[PDB]
Design a protein around this ligand. Sequence first.
Ligand code: HEM
Ligand code: HEM
Ligand SMILES: Cc1cc(N)nc(COC[C@H]2C[C@H](OCc3cc(C)cc(N)n3)CN2)c1
Ligand SMILES: Cc1cc(N)nc(COC[C@H]2C[C@H](OCc3cc(C)cc(N)n3)CN2)c1
Ligand SMILES: C[C@H](O)[C@H](O)[C@H]1CNc2nc(N)[nH]c(=O)c2N1
Ligand SMILES: C[C@H](O)[C@H](O)[C@H]1CNc2nc(N)[nH]c(=O)c2N1
Ligand SMILES: [Cl-]
Ligand SMILES: [Cl-]
Lengths: 362, 362
Amino acid sequence: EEKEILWNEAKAFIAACYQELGKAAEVKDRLADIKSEIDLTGSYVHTKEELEHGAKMAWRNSNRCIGRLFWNSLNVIDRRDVRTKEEVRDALFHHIETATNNGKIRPTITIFPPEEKGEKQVEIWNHQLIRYAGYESDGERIGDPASCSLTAACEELGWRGERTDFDLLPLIFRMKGDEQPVWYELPRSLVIEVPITHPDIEAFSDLELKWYGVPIISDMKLEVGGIHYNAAPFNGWYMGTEIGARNLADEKRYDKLKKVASVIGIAADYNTDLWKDQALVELNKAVLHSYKKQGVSIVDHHTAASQFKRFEEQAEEAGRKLTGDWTWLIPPISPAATHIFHRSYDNSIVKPNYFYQDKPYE
Amino acid sequence: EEKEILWNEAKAFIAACYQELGKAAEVKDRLADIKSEIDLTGSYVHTKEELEHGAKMAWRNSNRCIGRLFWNSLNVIDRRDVRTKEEVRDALFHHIETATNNGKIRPTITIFPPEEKGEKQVEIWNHQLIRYAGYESDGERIGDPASCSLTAACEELGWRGERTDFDLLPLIFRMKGDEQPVWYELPRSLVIEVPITHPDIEAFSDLELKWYGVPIISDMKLEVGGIHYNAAPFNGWYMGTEIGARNLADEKRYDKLKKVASVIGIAADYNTDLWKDQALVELNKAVLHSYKKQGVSIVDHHTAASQFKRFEEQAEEAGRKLTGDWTWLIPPISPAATHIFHRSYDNSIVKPNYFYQDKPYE
Ligand code: HEM
Ligand code: HEM
Ligand SMILES: Cc1cc(N)nc(COC[C@H]2C[C@H](OCc3cc(C)cc(N)n3)CN2)c1
Ligand SMILES: Cc1cc(N)nc(COC[C@H]2C[C@H](OCc3cc(C)cc(N)n3)CN2)c1
Ligand SMILES: C[C@H](O)[C@H](O)[C@H]1CNc2nc(N)[nH]c(=O)c2N1
Ligand SMILES: C[C@H](O)[C@H](O)[C@H]1CNc2nc(N)[nH]c(=O)c2N1
Ligand SMILES: [Cl-]
Ligand SMILES: [Cl-]
């Protein structure tokens, strides 16, 4: 069954991929080559070109992503050659540096060797390559609660955080053949952070908020033509609301709205005053202003939705069905001010695509 | 087939209804009575009690409604006795007066005779009993664009609006046996309106915005045990965002955000300034403040979502499955500040319920 699922996915992917690359004539022999290779080895190896275009198709098919307009300019780094943990570590350091690009963020994915018998070659433990630790003992919360279980897993392995609200977690990953993962402290010189200030309200700096420049998702599996690349971290630049309306605002995250309300000089006592909505807007203005001021790439939700409209139009003119998850595409502030809110989207899953996978801790 | 669909829906409704009313023992004979009545007459008549509880169940099952906590206190007016257009008109006038209740709004439904062969007895043309006219000729828009087709239909029948941005449309409905509907001007003494002012910003009154107090939906069919009440207008009180984030804000409605931005003293030039979001928040604060000041019932989206949480909890403790449409339940401003955003809902349709129907114009 496994080999048959593989062969079928291979067939579908090579046809579509080569059609898109104007290489439709080469499909026949490539398929024959693949079929033999699966018969002999139980799997098949992608060409550099197939892998790069597959990663791009995968982004293009990501129903929950509003930023898909730029799918075709994904920078794809092929690291199927890595065999040692030092090479894995160095590749992750490199991804951070080249994606950050002194603040002019390059959307990038680094692809590591794929699973074999469902057997991972490299198993990355981080949810994002750069993320803040979280702690909770005796009712006092420190840092990012979303990171508590990973943080506890790191500390069990001998890492220790300074217990600020913004401890950078170490890179942590396991190699095939090792029972324990290894971890490495992130060099601070590699990580850009932005302090949050407000364009008009001087007191906003009193909150001492900051966030990291580059979200680099490292817990999803890239699937391309039946090959499962479980370790393939990828990044874009942030949309402001991700930081302002969620990471810093959610009660189960940094929960900053009451403190924001206070520094902007409004009461946080009456639902009818819409103080949460107002705090949310000023916090989100501050996030966008701060990233721009530091020259770190970011996009606001209005501009992002306009870009996505163009993605829709581009899909139609290429004759490709559009897929999307309306529940994720609408921004969490003023959703009805975007065109997304007022239409519907087909939530069908199309491959290549990125998929969630189980984490080893948890 | 029709009689069989009817009988099946009757069976399901009477069982559930009587179970809820502690009258489970009476189900057997009531059903037998109904079965005979369908055999003879092709239909059946609800008791006062069945009709009232059915209307309430229908509200309870309305997946898109965040206000369902108060389902059991719906005020049900039984007007199955009406036969003349004067009686219809007077019943609609009465609904407006009693639902308005000098601003302390009573959630109310008036139920008119139901369809027979799919043949309506009373066909109401209004989408809401109280709504503003809309005009467009030579690129200048006046009033509410959502009302353009109905407005043109009224004027074709000899009504003429003053062409302010807030002309009250007349009541317009057709009786079985008449080819043309009739219309009646709304007595202004019956219609409460609220001028929109802002709690802090004096200049807000310069926009000369207002809205009507009571939304009374009159274009949906109430279905109860296979009986189709096509004419059964119902109302609640507004949630502020309906007025502030949609009716007054949507580009295809009153489109007021640029004017709001200007009176609140912010530029409307850069997406990154989040001027639309900020204008939306101040406009929504003004709407809530204005209704409260005038003593007209209204609810903000935070309070409304808290009430809905209780509706969920009440459903679970009664052993009733909960249904909902997440896409309508989240408010259009700060949705992620409500619990609704962070859970999912089963969108199954359960009857009794309210359903959209085709309009005669359009
Ligand atoms: C270039 C800038 C980018 C922006 C502004 C952007 C924006 C977003 C946003 C706002 C979300 C919703 C996230 C959430 O609410 O947690 C999202 C989800 C997603 N994006 Fe993008 N994105 C970008 C680039 C990329 C790239 C390069 C990829 C992959 C190659 C990608 C794949 C995805 C995926 C898979 C999700 C869903 C994640 C999940 O299920 O948790 N995006 N994106
Ligand atoms: C008492 C105060 C009430 C509040 C605050 C309230 C709130 C709302 C809101 C915000 C919506 C979404 C509307 C939209 O976006 O256009 C809605 C939809 C709805 N409500 Fe309620 N509601 C209330 C009372 C009622 C009552 C009394 C009924 C019926 C007996 C009802 C039945 C519905 C229905 C059927 C919809 C869906 C309408 C559609 O599909 O267009 N509601 N409600
Ligand atoms: C590449 C990228 C760019 C950008 N601007 N933003 C993102 C946001 O992705 C962040 C990730 C973190 C949470 O993951 C939650 C999650 C959990 C589970 C179990 C499944 C799933 N699909 N997603 C939500 N999306 C990713
Ligand atoms: C009873 C009630 C109370 C309250 N606070 N708000 C409401 C809002 O209902 C207003 C109505 C007007 C639009 O109707 C649109 C519509 C169109 C169509 C074709 C189907 C459908 N279900 N709904 C959206 N909901 C109703
Ligand atoms: C159907 C389409 O997604 C459309 O934008 C919906 C979305 N959610 C909504 N939610 C509410 N409350 N009211 C609406 O009119 C809509 N419109
Ligand atoms: C799944 C559940 O509805 C949950 O609240 C979703 C809704 N929409 C979302 N949209 C985005 N962009 N990000 C999220 O994490 C979520 N969470
Ligand atoms: Cl994030
Ligand atoms: Cl309305």
